[PDB]
XYZ file of C-alpha atoms in Angstrom:
333
model
C 25.963 -8.593 4.583
C 24.198 -5.662 2.833
C 22.902 -2.618 4.759
C 21.814 -0.479 1.806
C 18.080 -0.969 2.286
C 17.552 -0.881 6.087
C 19.119 -4.205 7.029
C 20.587 -4.570 10.524
C 22.440 -7.358 12.329
C 22.235 -6.539 16.056
C 19.911 -9.397 17.139
C 21.962 -12.542 16.303
C 20.784 -15.476 14.147
C 17.264 -16.955 14.039
C 16.376 -20.663 13.889
C 12.573 -20.429 14.145
C 10.246 -17.926 12.417
C 9.298 -16.344 15.771
C 11.366 -16.112 18.983
C 10.443 -14.752 22.423
C 12.724 -11.950 23.627
C 12.975 -10.396 27.115
C 12.961 -6.905 25.629
C 12.566 -5.699 22.074
C 15.969 -4.413 20.921
C 14.428 -0.969 20.383
C 14.907 2.242 22.378
C 11.948 4.445 23.307
C 8.172 4.382 23.037
C 6.059 3.959 19.885
C 5.469 7.372 18.360
C 1.901 6.757 17.156
C -0.105 5.993 20.309
C -2.969 8.269 19.083
C -3.245 6.595 15.662
C -3.200 3.132 17.270
C -6.044 4.123 19.604
C -7.929 5.445 16.539
C -7.235 2.211 14.655
C -8.445 0.092 17.557
C -11.637 2.192 17.783
C -12.278 1.378 14.115
C -11.827 -2.329 14.794
C -14.152 -1.991 17.793
C -16.908 -0.464 15.609
C -16.383 -2.032 12.172
C -15.446 -5.532 13.302
C -16.994 -6.455 16.720
C -16.001 -10.152 16.269
C -12.336 -9.383 15.507
C -12.177 -6.825 18.298
C -13.595 -9.272 20.844
C -10.886 -11.815 20.076
C -7.972 -9.437 20.266
C -9.070 -6.906 22.918
C -6.893 -8.573 25.568
C -3.860 -7.597 23.524
C -5.299 -4.190 22.586
C -6.077 -3.338 26.214
C -2.647 -4.465 27.471
C -0.980 -2.315 24.767
C -3.261 0.594 25.614
C -2.562 0.319 29.323
C 1.151 0.120 28.681
C 1.019 3.088 26.307
C -0.800 5.310 28.842
C 1.727 4.431 31.575
C 4.483 5.706 29.284
C 4.781 3.106 26.558
C 8.517 2.487 26.899
C 9.767 -0.847 25.450
C 11.660 -1.602 28.698
C 8.360 -1.693 30.661
C 6.350 -4.322 28.769
C 6.514 -7.386 31.024
C 4.545 -5.663 33.821
C 1.561 -5.578 31.436
C 1.695 -9.274 30.531
C 2.802 -8.373 26.970
C 5.101 -10.834 25.201
C 7.162 -9.790 22.194
C 7.943 -12.355 19.513
C 10.629 -11.068 17.151
C 10.261 -12.000 13.483
C 13.204 -13.695 11.709
C 12.269 -11.860 8.472
C 13.715 -12.348 4.963
C 17.239 -13.441 5.910
C 17.053 -14.851 9.446
C 18.720 -11.763 10.869
C 15.382 -10.265 11.910
C 15.160 -7.917 8.933
C 11.532 -7.900 7.899
C 10.594 -7.022 4.286
C 8.646 -3.804 4.154
C 6.927 -2.321 1.171
C 4.255 0.375 1.325
C 0.989 1.151 -0.365
C -1.465 4.060 -0.333
C -4.715 5.496 -1.671
C -3.757 7.814 -4.529
C -5.676 10.996 -5.378
C -5.837 11.646 -9.115
C -5.597 15.297 -10.130
C -8.128 15.863 -12.916
C -10.142 18.572 -14.720
C -13.565 18.576 -16.447
C -12.241 19.869 -19.817
C -9.013 19.238 -21.748
C -6.318 21.746 -20.664
C -2.616 22.100 -19.756
C -1.184 18.775 -18.588
C -4.677 17.236 -18.200
C -5.094 15.295 -21.432
C -5.828 11.712 -20.343
C -9.539 10.749 -20.272
C -11.254 8.392 -17.821
C -14.489 6.812 -19.098
C -17.933 5.648 -17.978
C -19.494 2.455 -19.493
C -21.081 2.863 -22.921
C -24.278 0.836 -23.571
C -22.894 -2.348 -25.058
C -22.197 -3.151 -28.696
C -20.560 -6.434 -27.742
C -17.157 -5.545 -29.224
C -15.606 -2.494 -27.538
C -12.264 -1.109 -28.926
C -8.800 -1.986 -27.611
C -6.792 0.261 -25.282
C -4.666 1.573 -28.177
C -7.787 2.378 -30.178
C -9.310 4.217 -27.208
C -6.113 6.268 -26.757
C -6.336 7.299 -30.425
C -9.899 8.520 -29.727
C -12.126 5.628 -30.869
C -14.522 6.507 -28.058
C -16.826 9.521 -28.045
C -16.482 12.363 -25.532
C -19.984 12.018 -24.123
C -18.408 9.080 -22.197
C -15.642 11.051 -20.471
C -15.842 11.528 -16.701
C -12.652 13.530 -16.198
C -9.414 14.400 -17.938
C -6.475 13.515 -15.769
C -2.939 14.604 -15.154
C -1.267 11.214 -15.744
C -1.620 8.209 -18.077
C 0.134 5.853 -15.678
C -2.178 6.953 -12.806
C -5.193 5.978 -14.942
C -3.674 2.567 -15.497
C -3.120 2.062 -11.782
C -6.796 3.074 -11.406
C -7.727 0.297 -13.848
C -5.845 -2.367 -11.907
C -7.330 -1.180 -8.593
C -10.676 -0.916 -10.361
C -11.539 2.361 -8.616
C -9.998 5.618 -7.545
C -10.357 8.939 -5.821
C -10.354 12.095 -8.014
C -9.753 15.675 -6.913
C -10.970 18.299 -9.380
C -9.042 20.990 -7.548
C -11.982 23.199 -6.632
C -13.764 23.420 -3.322
C -15.473 20.098 -3.527
C -15.128 16.717 -1.766
C -13.096 13.920 -3.274
C -14.948 12.118 -6.008
C -14.947 8.334 -5.873
C -15.349 6.202 -9.027
C -15.864 2.398 -8.883
C -15.580 -0.476 -11.381
C -18.347 -0.398 -13.969
C -17.046 -2.805 -16.646
C -14.352 -3.704 -19.212
C -13.800 -3.602 -23.008
C -13.819 -7.370 -23.635
C -10.175 -7.571 -24.784
C -8.252 -9.849 -22.416
C -5.710 -8.178 -20.172
C -2.009 -8.897 -20.254
C 0.248 -8.140 -17.295
C 2.280 -4.904 -17.646
C 4.405 -6.238 -14.769
C 5.588 -9.281 -16.778
C 6.454 -6.992 -19.725
C 8.728 -4.816 -17.547
C 10.323 -7.995 -16.131
C 10.819 -9.645 -19.609
C 12.670 -6.454 -20.673
C 14.843 -6.140 -17.556
C 13.366 -2.705 -16.794
C 12.341 -3.997 -13.337
C 13.651 -6.974 -11.319
C 11.164 -9.788 -10.620
C 11.330 -9.461 -6.797
C 10.881 -5.647 -6.631
C 7.837 -5.756 -8.916
C 4.747 -4.079 -7.530
C 2.209 -1.546 -8.686
C 4.401 1.046 -6.905
C 7.416 0.018 -9.026
C 5.306 0.425 -12.200
C 4.454 3.934 -10.966
C 8.108 4.815 -10.408
C 9.004 3.402 -13.835
C 6.290 5.647 -15.249
C 7.435 8.805 -13.398
C 10.979 8.259 -14.770
C 10.041 7.875 -18.460
C 8.571 9.990 -21.274
C 4.891 10.073 -22.218
C 5.755 8.242 -25.467
C 7.698 5.497 -23.637
C 4.730 5.084 -21.243
C 1.966 4.912 -23.881
C 4.122 2.380 -25.780
C 4.323 0.184 -22.662
C 0.670 0.631 -21.678
C -0.511 -0.308 -25.164
C 0.956 -3.806 -24.622
C -2.265 -4.447 -22.634
C -5.375 -4.119 -24.835
C -7.838 -4.345 -21.950
C -9.602 -1.278 -20.559
C -11.701 -0.419 -17.529
C -14.780 1.831 -17.244
C -16.100 3.460 -14.076
C -19.142 5.093 -12.592
C -19.556 7.692 -9.825
C -20.040 6.163 -6.372
C -20.884 7.585 -2.937
C -17.608 8.123 -1.024
C -16.525 5.629 1.650
C -13.525 5.755 4.062
C -10.803 3.408 2.803
C -11.231 -0.112 4.230
C -8.952 -3.152 3.941
C -9.904 -6.763 3.342
C -11.098 -7.145 6.953
C -13.603 -4.305 6.428
C -11.992 -2.030 9.029
C -11.227 1.586 8.082
C -7.452 1.691 7.807
C -5.305 4.265 9.624
C -2.120 5.579 7.978
C 0.985 3.850 9.271
C -1.125 2.062 11.929
C -2.161 -0.828 9.668
C -0.483 -3.335 7.387
C -1.485 -5.908 4.816
C -0.125 -9.327 5.739
C -0.215 -13.045 4.930
C -3.174 -14.529 6.807
C -1.499 -17.871 7.428
C 1.379 -16.091 9.206
C -0.042 -12.916 10.691
C -3.773 -13.425 11.128
C -5.927 -10.284 10.758
C -5.958 -8.330 14.019
C -2.452 -9.299 15.069
C -0.716 -6.430 16.903
C 2.710 -5.457 15.615
C 5.568 -3.448 17.025
C 7.725 -2.193 14.205
C 10.927 -0.300 13.569
C 9.886 1.050 10.170
C 12.610 2.279 7.739
C 12.274 5.920 6.570
C 12.803 6.984 2.961
C 14.702 9.649 0.995
C 12.780 11.873 -1.389
C 14.644 9.551 -3.809
C 12.917 6.527 -2.256
C 16.207 5.410 -0.667
C 16.738 4.257 2.947
C 17.904 7.398 4.821
C 19.475 5.796 7.905
C 16.452 6.396 10.168
C 13.743 4.189 11.642
C 10.524 5.047 13.392
C 9.030 2.829 16.107
C 5.254 2.459 15.466
C 2.426 0.171 16.478
C 0.340 -1.374 13.700
C -2.383 -3.961 13.259
C -2.724 -6.449 10.378
C -5.981 -5.454 8.595
C -5.607 -6.033 4.837
C -4.170 -8.550 2.315
C -2.425 -8.524 -1.075
C -1.897 -10.975 -3.948
C 1.867 -10.881 -3.501
C 2.016 -10.176 0.242
C 3.150 -13.562 1.478
C 5.173 -14.907 4.385
C 6.877 -12.411 6.656
C 6.403 -9.578 4.135
C 4.287 -6.624 5.254
C 2.732 -3.909 3.157
C 2.268 -0.746 5.255
C -0.741 1.397 4.629
C 0.674 4.902 4.252
C -2.682 6.718 4.109
C -4.248 8.789 1.359
C -2.585 11.300 -0.995
C 0.877 12.190 -2.392
C 2.789 12.523 0.865
C 1.681 9.013 1.816
C 2.626 8.282 -1.770
C 6.214 9.433 -1.197
C 6.578 7.533 2.062
C 5.495 4.256 0.451
C 8.470 3.900 -1.885
C 8.775 1.443 -4.782
C 11.176 -1.306 -3.718
C 11.832 -3.512 -0.654
C 13.244 -2.071 2.553
C 13.846 -3.631 5.938
C 12.983 -3.074 9.582
C 12.342 -5.230 12.617
C 9.044 -6.436 13.938
C 7.855 -7.858 17.210
C 4.468 -9.523 17.291
C 2.679 -8.663 20.524
C 0.743 -11.343 22.372
C -0.710 -11.643 25.886
C 0.815 -14.142 28.389
């Protein structure tokens, strides 16, 4: 009965994936009332249809929050709480986190900034492989920025876009997908699994980042070269970060979730496990409200991916392996 990663065993044993409780086994009020309101406002504006179908829940929650928001006082607002059985049938929901990174970069080669990011060259047909581009097969008229981190560029390839901060006065610079090199991609995840460097079930882009951070530049290039594919980008006008449902996401007030289990717009009450600067469960939870507003290729079942927000602090809070909390889905009577 492991406890290492946020697991708890105070709510008995579950038979069905959701079960009505009289009160969430959670003491206090959610700590993010403001953010939730802000998130709701974004649903209201960016997704009128979605908002119209869930507003009954959103209003109840709002009304309850304004009256003091304590978990003991939910029934008087017609709010039901369905606790989620989670990964083990002890209520312990699988939580990973994700976040918009900001790539530190500079316009000329200097200091730690020695890792180019390219725009699309007018086609030849055959563009060079990743390894060839690293060696400098490509000209320098095609560089957009030199960045701080080779692994961060890779993560930008998989995302297909990224935010770059040149460290002067100016606004964040967004770059979107422009094209590829024509060499077929191979999955850097699989490689790290087929070497035992990372376990199959803790694999995620985040885990590839941590693996990066903990290895040498040589070890990283070696690994990255295993994938001969390469992305190119172009400058794009900046846009607030939206999830699959086209609603601007609010840090720690939104999750990505499996549509067939937690339909977009579902309201969630979560005890979310806090992390060490190590990325280790630190013994503390945080009771927050969140709405399901995004999706992910490996975000299935009762697994949630919390949107931590933008930047490195959000980055830290996201972690790089599974942790566990408790969730109650909130529905109107």
